[PDB]
Amino acid sequence: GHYDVLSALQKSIRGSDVDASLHYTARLIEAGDLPSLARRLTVIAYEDIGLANPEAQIHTVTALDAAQKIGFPEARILIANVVIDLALSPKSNSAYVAMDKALADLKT
Amino acid sequence: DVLSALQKSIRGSDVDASLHYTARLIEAGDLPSLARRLTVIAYEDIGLANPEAQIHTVTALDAAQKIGFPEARILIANVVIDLALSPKSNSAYVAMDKALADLK
Amino acid sequence: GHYDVLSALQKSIRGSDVDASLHYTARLIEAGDLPSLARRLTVIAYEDIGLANPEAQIHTVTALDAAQKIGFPEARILIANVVIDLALSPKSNSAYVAMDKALADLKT
Amino acid sequence: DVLSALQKSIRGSDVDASLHYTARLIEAGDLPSLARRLTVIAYEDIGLANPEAQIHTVTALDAAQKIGFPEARILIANVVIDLALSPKSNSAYVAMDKALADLK
Ligand SMILES: [Cl-]
Ligand SMILES: [Cl-]
């Protein structure tokens, strides 16, 4: 599943570290699991970038759905655009925090 | 009617209330009906005041249905906050229902 | 097929006549053929608006694909946004003309 | 190689030549291969210079495959002119292949 590498990719993007983000992405492309990489990058776009740059989510979902159809090797070019966009995007996890607060606030 | 309470809260630009009713609807467990209603709200209550909100809403909700819970709640949160904060218009909805009434 | 009403809708949008565009759209919604209405509005977005407003095509395809899933009656609200957008959009059919010129120019 | 001639014409920002090779490819009749290549060109040759071009390209080509000919040629024309006129970047492509080479 390469969950260790997926975690390193999320930390790299959260830390706005574009060279490390591309390195961990390269390791996942060589391993060949496009579905798990597309799923994690979609979650990162909404969790870590979120409301700071809504257009990053449009470009991420569009590229990753197209990538899963095109398949490797050409899919690596679509993924490269996504990873650079997310690593160098303004970022806010406030949507994630607000959602979990609303769930915690429900009467039990 | 929790879906109608969510629509009223988004129309009123009330982020905290909108997320409260969203949390209740996530726990009630009908994602298709929540997604359908948020899509309608984006075109009915935001509409021409902020067309980008419709692209954000449809993109996030289609992706949310594909990734499922638990992560779908994060995508839904982005949609609900966007719609609650967005400028508001009912002009396209009104124009359409005026034109349909004119046929009779 | 209501091809007469679909033709009147295209002429209404080409002529930037928003009230006539909504009237012909209303007639097609009452008739109930969402697929034929979605197909014609997609072609109008690329043929008549085209390169003058590329974002009109993104908003049109997004709304109409969502509409065909939601179904009437709520689909009328999505379609209303599309028809007003296209009727009041800047317009150029230059992509249509250039494509047909390139086909006519091929050696035979 | 007509697909490679189309890529060279788009890279050179040559609208007339790009539409010439597109017309040849439409008549040759393989829409899936033309759509795949134009999608790759949008991310490889335009890339970060104009991200909107990728949204336009994927949206139009998916719709073109769904509506078929004859109308698909109009959607394809919008894509090819957009990519030929667009600002050009290979920076994302290069960065990705540099990172993959660094693994070895
Ligand atoms: Cl994951
Ligand atoms: Cl038609």
The CATH topology of domain C3-105 is Zinc Finger, Delta Prime; domain 3 (1.20.272)
CB contact under 8 A, B27 and A105: no
**How buried is residue C17: exposed, middle or buried, by Cβ count under 10 Å (0-12/13-18/19+)?**
middle
Would you call C32 an interface residue with chain B, using a CB distance cutoff of 8 Å? Answer: no
User: Residue C92 to residues A10, B30, C46, C47, D92: CA-CA distances in angstroms?
Assistant: 44, 44, 9, 8, 32
Calpha distance A1→A82 (Å, rounded) = 21
Q: Which of C19, C27, C81 is closest, CB to CB, to B48?
A: C81
Label each residue of C52-74 as H, E or C. HCHHHHHHHHHHHHHHHHHCCCC
Would you call B20 an interface residue with chain A, using a CB distance cutoff of 8 Å? Answer: yes
Calpha distance D56→A51 (Å, rounded) = 23
Would you call A54 an interface residue with chain B, using a CB distance cutoff of 8 Å? Answer: yes
For an interface test with B, give the residue of C5, C30, C78 to mutate (most B CBs within 10 A).
C78
User: Residue B64 to residues B13, B34, C36, C65, D77: CA-CA distances in angstroms?
Assistant: 23, 11, 29, 17, 33
For the record, the structure tokens of C48 come out as 């008549």
> What is the CATH class of D2-102?
mainly alpha
Calpha distance A43→A32 (Å, rounded) = 19
Q: What distance in Å separates residue B70's CA from the closest CA in chain C?
A: 24
Q: Amino acid identity of C89?
A: S
**How buried is residue C60: exposed, middle or buried, by Cβ count under 10 Å (0-12/13-18/19+)?**
buried
**What DSSP state is assigned to residue B103?**
T
Resolution (A): 1.3
For the record, the structure tokens of C16 come out as 């930037």
Calpha distance B20→B38 (Å, rounded) = 14
Q: Decide: helix, strand or coil at residue C96.
A: helix
CB contact under 8 A, B75 and A46: yes
Calpha distance D78→B63 (Å, rounded) = 27
Q: Which of B19, B73, B78 is closest, CB to CB, to A50?
A: B78
**Spatial contact of D42 and D57, defined as CB atoms under 8 Å apart:** yes
Q: Which of C47, C54, C106 is closest, CB to CB, to D82?
A: C54
Backbone angle region of B86, left / alpha / beta, with phi > 0 → left and psi within -120 to 50 → alpha:
beta
Would you call B78 an interface residue with chain A, using a CB distance cutoff of 8 Å? Answer: yes
Would you call D32 an interface residue with chain A, using a CB distance cutoff of 8 Å? Answer: no
Q: What is the CA radius of gyration of chain B?
A: 14
Q: Among all residues of chain D, which has the CA nearest to that of A57?
A: D55
For the record, the structure tokens of C6 come out as 């679909």
> Which listed ligand is nearest to B67 at the C-alpha?
1
Calpha distance C11→C15 (Å, rounded) = 6
Residues in contact with B61: Cβ distance below 8 Å, sequence separation at least 6, in sequence order:
B35, B38, B39, B75, B76, B79
Calpha distance B42→B7 (Å, rounded) = 10
Q: What distance in Å separates residue B101's CA from the closest CA in chain A?
A: 36
Q: Decide: helix, strand or coil at residue B1.
A: coil
Would you call C22 an interface residue with chain B, using a CB distance cutoff of 8 Å? Answer: yes
For residue B32, whether the previous peptide bond is cis, meaning omega lies within 30 degrees of 0, is: no
Nearest C-alpha neighbor of B27 from the set B73, B94, B95, B87: B73
